Amino acid sequence: SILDLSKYIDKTIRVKFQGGREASGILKGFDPLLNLVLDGTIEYMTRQLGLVVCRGTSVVLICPQ
Amino acid sequence: MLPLSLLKTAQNHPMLVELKNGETYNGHLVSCDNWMNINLREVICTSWRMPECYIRGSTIKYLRIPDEIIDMVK
Amino acid sequence: MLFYSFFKSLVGKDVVVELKNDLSICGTLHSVDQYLNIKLTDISVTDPEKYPHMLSVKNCFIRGSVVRYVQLPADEVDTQLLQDAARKE
Amino acid sequence: EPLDLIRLSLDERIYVKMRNDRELRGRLHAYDQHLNMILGDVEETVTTIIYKSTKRNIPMLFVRGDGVVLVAPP
Amino acid sequence: SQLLPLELVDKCIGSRIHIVMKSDKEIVGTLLGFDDFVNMVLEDVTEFEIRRITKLDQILLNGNNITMLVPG
Amino acid sequence: TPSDFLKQIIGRPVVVKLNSGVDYRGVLACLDGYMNIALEQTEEYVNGQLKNKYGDAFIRGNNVLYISTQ
Amino acid sequence: ALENYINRTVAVITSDGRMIVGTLKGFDQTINLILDESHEEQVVLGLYIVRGDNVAVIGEI
Numbered sequence: 001s002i003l004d005l006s007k008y009i010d011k012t013i014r015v016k017f018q019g020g021r022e023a024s025g026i027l028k029g030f031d032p033l034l035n036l037v038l039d040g041t042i043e044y045m046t047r048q049l050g051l052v053v054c055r056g057t058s059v060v061l062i063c064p065q
Numbered sequence: 066m067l068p069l070s071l072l073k074t075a076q077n078h079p080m081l082v083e084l085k086n087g088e089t090y091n092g093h094l095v096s097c098d099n100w101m102n103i104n105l106r107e108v109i110c111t112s113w114r115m116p117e118c119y120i121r122g123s124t125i126k127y128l129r130i131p132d133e134i135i136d137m138v139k
Numbered sequence: 140m141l142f143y144s145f146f147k148s149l150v151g152k153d154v155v156v157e158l159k160n161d162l163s164i165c166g167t168l169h170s171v172d173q174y175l176n177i178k179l180t181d182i183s184v185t186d187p188e189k190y191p192h193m194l195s196v197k198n199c200f201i202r203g204s205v206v207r208y209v210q211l212p213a214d215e216v217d218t219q220l221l222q223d224a225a226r227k228e
Numbered sequence: 229e230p231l232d233l234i235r236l237s238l239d240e241r242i243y244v245k246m247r248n249d250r251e252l253r254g255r256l257h258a259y260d261q262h263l264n265m266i267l268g269d270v271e272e273t274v275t276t277i278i279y280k281s282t283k284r285n286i287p288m289l290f291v292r293g294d295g296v297v298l299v300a301p302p
Numbered sequence: 303s304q305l306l307p308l309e310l311v312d313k314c315i316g317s318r319i320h321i322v323m324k325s326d327k328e329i330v331g332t333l334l335g336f337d338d339f340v341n342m343v344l345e346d347v348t349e350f351e352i353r354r355i356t357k358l359d360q361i362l363l364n365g366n367n368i369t370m371l372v373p374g
Numbered sequence: 375t376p377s378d379f380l381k382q383i384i385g386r387p388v389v390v391k392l393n394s395g396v397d398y399r400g401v402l403a404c405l406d407g408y409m410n411i412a413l414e415q416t417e418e419y420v421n422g423q424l425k426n427k428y429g430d431a432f433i434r435g436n437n438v439l440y441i442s443t444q
Numbered sequence: 445a446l447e448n449y450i451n452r453t454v455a456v457i458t459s460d461g462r463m464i465v466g467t468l469k470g471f472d473q474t475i476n477l478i479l480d481e482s483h484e485e486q487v488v489l490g491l492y493i494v495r496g497d498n499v500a501v502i503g504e505i
Contacts, residue, residue: 043322129488142264198504212288229405
């Protein structure tokens, strides 16, 4: 993969999703398909979820925080 | 030459990506794959300055290249 | 793989193509591919309002994914062939 | 299997729903897994907001499968 | 050491889950199972637009339009 | 585990919901790997209003959001 | 195949109904077009990369 997600883990990231969703969370886990596991997940649509899993296939953009 | 090859060798250049979303992204290019997923450094995004960004290929509309481009890769 | 074969049997025929964005283009089918991309020669305007912003250009590459309809004439197509080949798949 | 029960109606009048509130009725001539379609003697109705427009294509319209929602009989 | 996401879905099996589409729809019910494409089997699922329906039995939810999964 | 499901409920009564919000109640004749469905069922749940009644139907698998039993 | 169009000027119609004029330089199997001297009349850029997704229609002029 072109992005080394290893650095990010235990770091707060900002992910845009296809369909106009923003999510900010703490990167707990990830895969080669770019599915993520986020912690303290807040979804800006304020919406608070917790430990979420984000489908890599709709993962549209990813920055830090 | 092919889009992908062009990007592949435009590594280290500056470029401006339009998203399907309507978002403009100004950055220097760091990595490209065959899906056209991009990583950029020194980034500014317009509806925000960031260190690094990752962009899925399927969400790009078009990429403005620096005019240097042809001479820099080739 | 079938509709490719079909379109190949339609070359040098006049067809009217309707794309999703409400654009309508008459012309001569010159080429056909696996994505069902079409190439028309002798571009023309079927309808007054839909027709996009062209003129001098006489040849177009149309992306398959952007076509809704292809308009055909009962004369251009053997129905029975089609039917048994569709069964065949 | 759902694609075979479609072979079932070949040469049999069919009713087709497409994205964008359009509806076709015609005689099934051909279909593919993509549910691409050729129909003949087919009438299309477009509902635009309420009015409905019509369009006739007796000879043989082809239809790109990706717009197709439902395929039944009138 | 890495936590794989599919492993996170695996352990929430038989639990309550919220499934958040890429649209404004949401489903909460018991997670019965999932595949590699993250198609999803829910049981007795509430359907919401952000209450549309109370489902009784088993729902296959197409992984295609799934955006977020939330245990609990 | 999803395949077992597709084979478990065939011939049971199901609601199939499409990307557009339309819902189809009918008997499950079959279903393939691409989510294509064989239905021939009514288009209205009840309260909103029944929009069509069709005996036999095919639902394009790209459009399906879910397949649910009652 | 878009091969006959290489290095020639083209009309480009995007799915959203927008219209471009450019030199077609590169193109791939996914219809990613590589473009030069583009105009949307105000010039957009000297070099630009465009996604196949956005392409409705290419015309040779």
